[PDB]
Design an enzyme around this catalytic site. Structure first.
Site, PDB file in Angstrom:
ATOM      1  N   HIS A   1      11.113   2.348  -2.778  1.00 41.18           N
ATOM      2  CA  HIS A   1      10.674   2.911  -1.498  1.00 41.18           C
ATOM      3  C   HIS A   1      11.469   2.421  -0.266  1.00 41.18           C
ATOM      4  CE1 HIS A   1       8.135   3.004   2.122  1.00 41.18           C
ATOM      5  NE2 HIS A   1       8.071   4.293   1.804  1.00 41.18           N
TER       6      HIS A   1
ATOM      7  N   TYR B   1      -1.179   6.367  10.551  1.00 41.09           N
ATOM      8  CA  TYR B   1      -1.932   6.974   9.431  1.00 41.09           C
ATOM      9  C   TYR B   1      -3.305   7.455   9.864  1.00 41.09           C
ATOM     10  CZ  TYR B   1       1.237   4.456   6.201  1.00 41.09           C
ATOM     11  OH  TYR B   1       2.314   3.990   5.527  1.00 41.09           O
TER      12      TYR B   1
ATOM     13  N   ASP C   1      10.294   7.144   5.676  1.00 43.28           N
ATOM     14  CA  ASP C   1       8.847   6.972   5.558  1.00 43.28           C
ATOM     15  C   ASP C   1       8.162   7.675   6.745  1.00 43.28           C
ATOM     16  OD1 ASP C   1       6.509   5.472   4.084  1.00 43.28           O
ATOM     17  OD2 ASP C   1       6.334   4.907   6.195  1.00 43.28           O
TER      18      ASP C   1
HETATM   19  C1  DUL Z   1       2.393   0.450   2.278  1.00 45.18           C
HETATM   20  C2  DUL Z   1       3.756   0.245   2.762  1.00 45.18           C
HETATM   21  S1  DUL Z   1       4.559   1.799   2.632  1.00 45.18           S
HETATM   22  C3  DUL Z   1       5.055   2.070   0.850  1.00 45.18           C
HETATM   23  C4  DUL Z   1       5.252   3.363   0.161  1.00 45.18           C
HETATM   24  C5  DUL Z   1       5.656   3.474  -1.250  1.00 45.18           C
HETATM   25  C6  DUL Z   1       5.828   2.329  -2.074  1.00 45.18           C
HETATM   26  C7  DUL Z   1       5.717   1.033  -1.458  1.00 45.18           C
HETATM   27  C8  DUL Z   1       5.775  -0.230  -2.165  1.00 45.18           C
HETATM   28  C9  DUL Z   1       5.709  -1.357  -1.507  1.00 45.18           C
HETATM   29  C10 DUL Z   1       5.662  -2.417  -2.171  1.00 45.18           C
HETATM   30  C11 DUL Z   1       5.671  -2.275  -3.469  1.00 45.18           C
HETATM   31  C12 DUL Z   1       5.638  -3.563  -4.212  1.00 45.18           C
HETATM   32  N1  DUL Z   1       4.846  -3.679  -5.277  1.00 45.18           N
HETATM   33  O1  DUL Z   1       6.298  -4.545  -3.929  1.00 45.18           O
HETATM   34  S2  DUL Z   1       5.706  -0.533  -3.870  1.00 45.18           S
HETATM   35  C13 DUL Z   1       5.298   0.952  -0.003  1.00 45.18           C
END
Ligand code: DUL
Ligand code: DUL
Lengths: 546, 546
Positions: free
Chosen positions: B523, B465, B334
Site C-alpha cells: 500500500h 474518512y 490513497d
Molecule cells: C490505515 C492506513 S491506510 C492503509 C490501506 C491499505 C493497506 C494498509 C496497510 C498498512 C499496514 C499494513 C501492515 N500490516 O503493516 S497493511 C494501510
C-alpha cells in the site's frame, strides 16, 4: 444606497463576447442567418448547452452534441455545412481571441477601492479542452480583483433562473436595492430588476460606465492612470530556505515560468517590489522576491563579515541549489543592484540575465583604497556615517515610523540633506519629528516596514556598508573579466546619490549592455515609478531572458 | 586509515572527458596530431588557458585567445585550418556530450554513506556562454552529493600547483594519509602523492573502482541497485500559503519547469514523496510536495466538514491562485489519489494532468448509501472503525512510534489484520508493542513522522474518512461527466485494500486513461517501490504533461 457591484464575464469583463462569434461565423461562411445560433440554444433548458452551463457535462462532451445540433438545423434550412467545419476550431479561436475588457476591470477596481463588494456572475462551462490553460490564466488574472466568482457550472444553476439571483444576494449578504448588476443580455438582467437590483444593459463599454458612474456617484470614466496591482503580504506564498546553520532566507513567490530573483536595497524589504511581483508573474515569470540577509523574516547575524559581497553571493548560490534552480534572472536595486552585478561576475552560470535599477557597475580601483574613493564624492558622506557600529543603528531604530517616512519620499519631497551628514551628526538632524506622508506611500505601507524592522533592526542592513575593504579585495579578482551575459542598466534621472552619469562607462565592461531610463524618478525607483519600471523590465525580460 | 575521498570532474565524475575532444577533432579533421592540443596548453602557466582556469577571464573572453593560439600552431605546422572551424562549436558539443559517470557517482555516494567526507576538486572555468545552463544543471546535480566543491576559477589556484592541495586538506580538516584522490591526469596526481595522499590514476572506471574498493575496504563494484536520492527536511525550501483565515497549507518545493503537485494519503506527510521529489525535479519539473490539510505544518481545524472533498478541492484551487499557478499536474496516493480524481472532475481547467497511485476512480452509486457501499467490502471495515470521533485518535495517538512502525511495512511484513478491526476493537490489538523496523524505513524516517504527528495528531487526518455522505452527494453532480484530460492510473499488485482489480472499470469514465502497474508492491507505494514509481511517473510526465 449601493454597496455591491456584480459583473458578467462574456461581453462585460471580457471582449469580444464569445457568443457574437456564431453570427460572425455564419456571415464569413455565408450560412443562413442564425443557423449556428439555433444549434447553440437548441432545446433551451433541456438542451446540451444548459447541461454544459450547469456542470452536468464538460465542454469536450458538449462539442459533439453541438455539432449534432448543427446537422439538424441544416436539414430544416436546406444548405449543407462544409467538410472542414469544426465547432472545436471555432470555439478555440473565440475563447483565444477574448481578452479582458481593461476599462471595465478598472471601473470594478475603483468601486472595490471605495469599499464596494464586487463579484463576477457568469454562465460558464467545465473546460477540459487541450487548450483550456488560456482561459484558466484569464480567469486567474480577473478573479483576484473580486470578492466573489460565481460560476454557473460550479453552482449547478444558470442565468436567467431566479435561484442563482437569490444565491448571488446570499453570497453578497446584501439586499437587492444595495446591488448594481451589469450584463450584456437583457433576459439575464430582468430577474435582478424584479428583485429591485439596479441593472445596466452593457453594449458599448463607455455608455455602460457612464450609467455605472451616475448610479454610484463614483467617478469611473476619464480617471487618472491607476497604479499597477500591489501585494497584500498575507495573500502571498512565503518561502524559507536554510542556506547555512542559523542563516535562513525568506522570499515571496508568485507565478510560473523562468525564475526572476528580485534583490532589494537599503533599508528595504521584499515588499519594495510589491508593484513588480503581480506584473512580472502576469507577464509569464516565476517571481522570487527576497528579504535579503539582515532583513525582515530572513536571518540577521550580528557580525560585519556575514555581510560582505563574497558571503552574500555564495548564500544566493546555495539558495538556488536548495530550491533546485540551475539559474535565475537577477534583478537588483541599490545594495541588491550591487550584489546582482557581482553574481554576474562570479557566477555567470547561475545568472540567466542581470538587471540593475540605479546601481551602476563600477570596477574596483586597484590603486586606491575604497574608503579614499568614497571620500572623493560628497554624496557618499552618508556611507561614512554608517561605518561606526551603533551610531546609525541608534538614530534609525529610534523611531521606525519617522525613519521610513523621512527616507521614502519622491524627488520633489526631500526632507533629508544627505550631504555633510557626519558633521550634522545624523541623517535626521534637519528632519521633522513627524514627517508628512509622501504621495508615494500609504500609512499602512509605512507600518509594514516598521513591523518588519522591529525584528532585527538596522545592524545587519547597515553591515552591508561595513565591508568596503573586503569587497574591494574580492572585486579586484574580477578586474580582467567582462560581463557578457544579457544585462540591463536602469537609471533614475533624480537619484541624487546613484546619478545616471555614474553609469556612463559601463559599456566598457558590459559591451552588449541594454538600457532603461526613468525621468522624474528618485532613489526609491520601484514605488516612485512602478508602471515605467514594469514596462522596462517586462520588455527586457521577453526580449533577453526567455 | 582513510576517511575522505576526492574526485576530479572531467574524466572521473563526468564522461566523455571534454579534453579528449581536441584529439578527436584533429583526427576527424585530419589535422597534424596534437595541433589543437598545443593551442590549448600554449604558454602553460602564463597562457590564456591558465588565466581561464584561475578565473582571471571568462570562457567567452578565452575563446578568441584560443582560436588565435590556433592560427599560430598552424603557421609552424604548414597546414591551414578550414573556414567553418569553430572553437566555440567544438567546445559547445564537448560540454553538451559530457554526462555524469553514474557508477563513479554511486561509488562516491556509497563512501559518503559509510561516513566518508567527499569532495570534487576540479580545474574549471567561469562559463558565460549562451548555452552555460546545461553545465550549470550538471554541476547542480553532481554537487549536492558531496561535502565540498572546489573549483579552480573560484579559488584562483589550479591543479597541479601545490597550494590547491594544501587548500584541499585544510577544507577537509584532514591529513593527507586520510585522503584518496582520483584524477585522470597523472601530473595532477603527483603532488597529492608527495603529500602522502592515496592516489588513483583513472582510465577505465571499473579498474579505478577496483583500486578504490581495495584501498577503502568498502564494496563499491557489483553492489545492489541503490535507492533513488531522498530528502533531508532541513535542506528543503518550505512554502506556506494561507488559503483562508486560520487555514494555511505547507509544502516543500524543488526544481523548475511545469508544476507537479504531490498529494499524500493517510496518515502521511509531504515526506512520503521523499524519493520522488529529487527525481522529478531532476527530470525537469517544479515539484510542490504538500502537507495535506490536517497534517504536519499545515493547519488542522477540528470540525469534520473542514475535510469533505468539496472544501479540500476548493482550498487546493485557492493554493494555486495564491501561488499564481494557472495549472498543476496533480499526483495523489490513497486519500490524495481520491482528491486528485475530484480535482480533475470539478476543476479540469486547473489540472494539467492527473495521476493516482493505488486509488482508483469509482463513480458514486446514486442508488446506494456510501455507508452501505463500504460495508459490502470486508477490507474497508477499518473505515467504519474510523467513523466514531475519538476512538481511532486514542489508539493512533497512544504511541506514535508503534503506530508508524506497525503501519509502514512491505507486503511480506504485515503485522495488522485490517479485517474485523471493529470486532477486534482496534487496528493494533494483534500487533506487538514494539514492532520490528520494516526494511522499507529507517528509525530516523519513523521519528520524522512521529515529530510531525505530535503537532496535531490524528483528528484532522481521520476526518478525511468522516465525510462519506457529503462527498457522495457532491460526487453525484459529476455522474454525467467524463475525465478527458491526460490521466494515469498506477496499481500496486499487493495492496490488499486498494486492489488493482477495483480499477478495472476506469476506462468507462476515463477512455484515454494510461496505466502503470507495480508488482510486489504494498500500500505504501512511494517507499516500497521508489525506483519503479519514479520511472513510471517521469515517463508519463514527459509524454503526457509537457
Ligand atoms: C490505515 C492506513 S491506510 C492503509 C490501506 C491499505 C493497506 C494498509 C496497510 C498498512 C499496514 C499494513 C501492515 N500490516 O503493516 S497493511 C494501510
Ligand atoms: C540612505 C538610504 S539609501 C538612499 C540613496 C539615495 C537617495 C536616498 C534618499 C532618501 C531619502 C531622501 C529624502 N530626503 O527623503 S533622498 C536614499
Amino acid at each position: 444606497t449601493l454597496r455591491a457591484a456584480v459583473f458578467d464575464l462574456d461581453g462585460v469583463l471580457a471582449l469580444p463576447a464569445v457568443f457574437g462569434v456564431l453570427g460572425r461565423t455564419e456571415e464569413a461562411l455565408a450560412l443562413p442567418r442564425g443557423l449556428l445560433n439555433d444549434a447553440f440554444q437548441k432545446g433551451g433548458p433541456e438542451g446540451a448547452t444548459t447541461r454544459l452551463m450547469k456542470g452536468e457535462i464538460t465542454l469536450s462532451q458538449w462539442i459533439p452534441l453541438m455539432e449534432e445540433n448543427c446537422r439538424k438545423c441544416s436539414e430544416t434550412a436546406k444548405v449543407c455545412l462544409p467538410k472542414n467545419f469544426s465547432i472545436k476550431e471555432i470555439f478555440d479561436k473565440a475563447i483565444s481571441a477574448r481578452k479582458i475588457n481593461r476599462p471595465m476591470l478598472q471601473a470594478a477596481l475603483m468601486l472595490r477601492k471605495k469599499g464596494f463588494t464586487t463579484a463576477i456572475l457568469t454562465n460558464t462551462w467545465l473546460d477540459d479542452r487541450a487548450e483550456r490553460d488560456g482561459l484558466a490564466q484569464l480567469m486567474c488574472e480577473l478573479k483576484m480583483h473580486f470578492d466573489f466568482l460565481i460560476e454557473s457550472c460550479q453552482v449547478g444553476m444558470v442565468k436567467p433562473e431566479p435561484q442563482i439571483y437569490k444565491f448571488l444576494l446570499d453570497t453578497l449578504k446584501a439586499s437587492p436595492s444595495e446591488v448594481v448588476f451589469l450584463d450584456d443580455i437583457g433576459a439575464n438582467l430582468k430577474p435582478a430588476r424584479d428583485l429591485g437590483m439596479v441593472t445596466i444593459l452593457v453594449q458599448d463599454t463607455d455608455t455602460a460606465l457612464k450609467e455605472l458612474e451616475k448610479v454610484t456617484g463614483i467617478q469611473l470614466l476619464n480617471t487618472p492612470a491607476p497604479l499597477p496591482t500591489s501585494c497584500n503580504p498575507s495573500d502571498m506564498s512565503h518561502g524559507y530556505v536554510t542556506v547555512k546553520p542559523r542563516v535562513r532566507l525568506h522570499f515571496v513567490e508568485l507565478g510560473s515560468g523562468p525564475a526572476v530573483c528580485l534583490c532589494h536595497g537599503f533599508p528595504e524589504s521584499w515588499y519594495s517590489w510589491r508593484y513588480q511581483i503581480p506584473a512580472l508573474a502576469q507577464a509569464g515569470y516565476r517571481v522570487l522576491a527576497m528579504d535579503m540577509k539582515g532583513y525582515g523574516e530572513s536571518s540577521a547575524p550580528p557580525e560585519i563579515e556575514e555581510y560582505c559581497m563574497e558571503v552574500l553571493c555564495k548564500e544566493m548560490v546555495t539558495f538556488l541549489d536548495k530550491l533546485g534552480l540551475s539559474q535565475a534572472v537577477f534583478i537588483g536595486h541599490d545594495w541588491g543592484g550591487m550584489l546582482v552585478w557581482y553574481m554576474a561576475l562570479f557566477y555567470p552560470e547561475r545568472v540567466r540575465a542581470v538587471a540593475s535599477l540605479n546601481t551602476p557597475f563600477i570596477p574596483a580601483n586597484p590603486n586606491m583604497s575604497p574608503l579614499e574613493s568614497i571620500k572623493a564624492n560628497p554624496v557618499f558622506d552618508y556611507q561614512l556615517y554608517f561605518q561606526e557600529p551603533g551610531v546609525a543603528e541608534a538614530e534609525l531604530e529610534q523611531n521606525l515610523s519617522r525613519t521610513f517616512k523621512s527616507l521614502f519620499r519622491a524627488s520633489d519631497e526631500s526632507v533629508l540633506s544627505m550631504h555633510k551628514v557626519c558633521e550634522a551628526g545624523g541623517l535626521f538632524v534637519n528632519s521633522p519629528e513627524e514627517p508628512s506622508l509622501s504621495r508615494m506611500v500609504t500609512e499602512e505601507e509605512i507600518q509594514f516596514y516598521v513591523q518588519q524592522f522591529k525584528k532585527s533592526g538596522f545592524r545587519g542592513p547597515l553591515n552591508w556598508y561595513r565591508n568596503m575593504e573586503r569587497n574591494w579585495k574580492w572585486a579586484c579578482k574580477s578586474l580582467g573579466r567582462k560581463i557578457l551575459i544579457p544585462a540591463l542598466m536602469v537609471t533614475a534621472e533624480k537619484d541624487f546619490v546613484l546619478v545616471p552619469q555614474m553609469s556612463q562607462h559601463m559599456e566598457d565592461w558590459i559591451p552588449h549592455l541594454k538600457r532603461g531610463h526613468i525621468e522624474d524618478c528618485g532613489h526609491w525607483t520601484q514605488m516612485d515609478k512602478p508602471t515605467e519600471v514594469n514596462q522596462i523590465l517586462i520588455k527586457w525580460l521577453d526580449s533577453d531572458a526567455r
